[PDB]
Amino acid sequence: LLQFHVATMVDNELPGLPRAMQKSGRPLKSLKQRLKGKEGRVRGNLMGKR
DNA sequence: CAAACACACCAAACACAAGAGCTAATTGACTGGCCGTTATCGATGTATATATCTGACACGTGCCTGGAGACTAGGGAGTAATCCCCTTGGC
Numbered sequence: 604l605l606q607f608h609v610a611t612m613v614d615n616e617l618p619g620l621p622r623a624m625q626k627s628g629r630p631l632k633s634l635k636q637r638l639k640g641k642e643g644r645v646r647g648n649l650m651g652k653r
Numbered sequence: 654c655a656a657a658c659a660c661a662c663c664a665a666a667c668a669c670a671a672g673a674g675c676t677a678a679t680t681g682a683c684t685g686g687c688c689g690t691t692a693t694c695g696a697t698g699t700a701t702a703t704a705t706c707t708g709a710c711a712c713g714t715g716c717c718t719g720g721a722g723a724c725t726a727g728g729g730a731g732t733a734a735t736c737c738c739c740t741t742g743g744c
Contacts, residue, residue: 618666627680640668 611623615633623631638644 626682 611631611633613633614635615623615631625631641647
């Protein structure tokens with residue numbers, strides 16, 4: 604369980620493994636998701652800003 | 654026979670899917686155990702309201718004692734005459 608929780612903390616989406624879901628019923632935004640691609644940190648707030 | 658590499662095939666993942674710009678609306682956790690506050694139910698009264706019994710005062714009835722009424726019996730109190738004892742009066 605500890606391994607699963609940490610992996611979900613730094614990577615929500617895994618191949619085949621269950622996805623961490625908030626009790627409300629929505630997935631948790633792991634750090635990888637935070638800067639995986641567009642709308643992230645690099646392309647979202649370093650190469651393109653407001 | 655066992656080990657080296659090469660090839661074809663199968664099986665498993667990664668990341669991307671233009672630049673953005675505006676507006677709207679759906680989601681606003683939930684049973685249970687337990688502690689902590691507080692509302693309620695309960696006992697243990699003392700204070701006040703009412704009922705029963707006892708005591709003092711009031712009106713009324715009564716038993717008892719003494720007093721009062723009508724009538725009676727028969728004798729106590731009491732006129733009318735008399736005597737003469739004795740008192741007042743006198744020189």
